[PDB]
Amino acid sequence: SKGEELFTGVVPILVELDGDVNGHKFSVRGEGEGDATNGKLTLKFICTTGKLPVPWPTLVTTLVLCFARYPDHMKQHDFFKSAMPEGYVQERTISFKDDGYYKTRAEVKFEGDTLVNRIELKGIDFKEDGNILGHKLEYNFNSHNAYITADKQKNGIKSNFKIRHNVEDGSVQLADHYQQNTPIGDGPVLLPDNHYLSTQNALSKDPNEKRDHMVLLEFVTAAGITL
């Protein structure tokens, strides 16, 4: 299909986030590349406004599912590429157990040859000394599966899933994600049967980078529909 064709090689990525958590405003800018044939993302993110007021791991899911590797026998269920190049809106509510919540709205679309993810984030009702505003989460990530379902009355998809963040005292901080996606343009899209995305992440630091930053490697692969 036309949308699939845009992802057969390596695609440059730009990410721009504008955030406000408990009134503290901040911005993140990321740059890198996506390789959907391998389901592979490599990006470096910088906090352009100074210090990040929340832990980097809490922003991973917000900071491009069109780069998932869909197996050949499942390609008719790839909503994300079907919506390109005009793209889709991705909205989430992320509820941190015993703490506040993020509300996010993003547009994911091509701008020229570059795939751009432009996000607005608001964080509300966070505890001043909790795991998020208190920077008590470890700088790492766990592997996760997230189930996708069609949303007929919106001509899009929905998903809900739990992210587990490791806490410095050995406990776990749950981040409950509710997600919806809808096309920006008027062209036909592929609405999928039920399936899931399997995701892995590795977070690191650039030893010669003095700014507050995150180096991210991510793999995303679709599964859950048999031959």
In Å, how far are 134, 150, 170, 188 from 220, measured between CA atoms?
A: 30, 19, 27, 24
Collapse the DSSP code of 86 into the 3-class scheme (helix H, G, I; strand E, B; otherwise coil) and give the result: coil
What is the per-residue burial (b if ≥16 Cβ within 10 Å, else e) of 137-162? Answer: beeebeebebebebbeeeebbbbebe
Rounded (10°) CA dihedral 153, 174, 23, 178: 0
10-21 and 114-124 strand pairing: parallel
In Å, how far are 47, 125, 204, 219, 226 from 210, measured between CA atoms?
A: 11, 31, 14, 27, 47
- Outline where 84-161 has alpha helix (H): none
Q: In angstroms, how far apart are the furthest CA atoms of the chain?
A: 50
DSSP letter, residue 21? E
- Chain Cα centroid distance, residue 175: 13
Q: What ranges do the domains of the chain cover?
A: 2-223
- CATH fold of 2-223, please? Green Fluorescent Protein (2.40.155)
- Give the resolution to one decimal, in Å: 1.5
What residues pair up with 133 in beta bridges, in sequence order?
none
Residue 29, exposed/middle/buried by CB under 10 A (0-12, 13-18, 19+)?
A: middle
Tokens 């993302």 -> residue: 41
Q: Which of 133, 66, 148 is nearest to 106 (CA)?
A: 66
The pair of three-digit structure tokens given for residue 176, joined into one six-digit string: 């409950």
Q: Which of 88, 184, 96, 204 is nearest to 140 (CA)?
A: 204
187/175 Cα distance (integer angstroms):
34
- Chain Cα centroid distance, residue 20: 18
Helix (H) and strand (E) counts in the chain: 2, 11
167/13 Cα distance (integer angstroms):
30
Rounded (10°) CA dihedral 15, 91, 195, 14: -10
